């Protein structure tokens, strides 16, 4: 009983911080980090993230300054957010790639929000499986007869309790995104 509701929980949270990170990496006026984490440039024949190879750092609220690692890696970092789907286009002075954040067109506002909707709607199945599963293992404890009948009426309980815990928390992400989107 324990085990397979503990472990749910635990997963339910997981896969909460998972969800967060996630929608982090949506372009949105005032830039953040997460939205560059996606891109990626051939670094010695392996896809590098270039969130890997570089500083990023956000000064004023659209305006982002990024600092390559290795020097000689700037064209491939700054040719690589150019060809990104963020809608920027960066400039640099030798060693600082600088990229300005536009305003976003309500034209992409609401596909952005159509992403950020999607993102949630991965992550809430996921925690409906976690569900499932500890489920199905309180089912099997009760046919064979494991624990009281009490017992695990209570355990239900709690799992379906918890589950609509973190389904409610992926939804406040997604509407705090979406807030986001929209301001």
Same mark, same amino acid.
């Given at each position: ?16 911080? $998972?969800?967060?990170?996630? /929608?982090?990496? #949506?372009?949105?006026?005032? *830039? =953040? ?7 990626? +440039? ?15 750092? $956000?000064?004023?609220?659209? /305006?982002?300054? #990024?600092?390559?690692?290795? *020097? =000689? ?7 690589? +957010? ?28 609401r596909?952005?929000v ?64 979406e807030?986001?989107l929209?301001?």
């Amino acid at each position: 009983i324990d085990e397979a509701l503990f472990d749910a929980e635990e997963k339910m949270e997981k896969a909460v911080a $998972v969800a967060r990170d996630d /929608l982090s990496t #949506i372009r949105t006026g005032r *830039a =953040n980090p997460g939205m560059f984490s996606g891109i990626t +440039i051939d670094y010695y024949g392996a896809a590098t993230p270039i969130t890997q190879l570089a500083s990023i750092n $956000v000064p004023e609220a659209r /305006l982002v300054v #990024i600092k390559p690692y290795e *020097a =000689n890696q700037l064209r491939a970092i700054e040719t690589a +957010i150019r060809n990104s789907d963020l809608g920027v286009n960066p400039t640099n002075d030798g060693a600082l790639i600088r990229v300005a954040v536009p305003q976003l067109t309500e034209e992409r506002r609401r596909e952005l929000v159509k992403q950020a909707k999607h993102k949630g709607e991965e992550a809430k199945v996921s925690v409906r499986n976690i569900r499932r599963k500890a489920m199905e293992e309180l089912h099997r404890i009760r046919k064979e007869g494991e624990a009281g009948e009490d017992e695990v009426g209570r355990a239900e309980k709690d799992l379906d309790k918890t589950t609509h815990q973190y389904v409610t928390q992926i939804d406040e992400l997604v509407k705090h995104k979406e807030g986001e989107l929209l301001e």
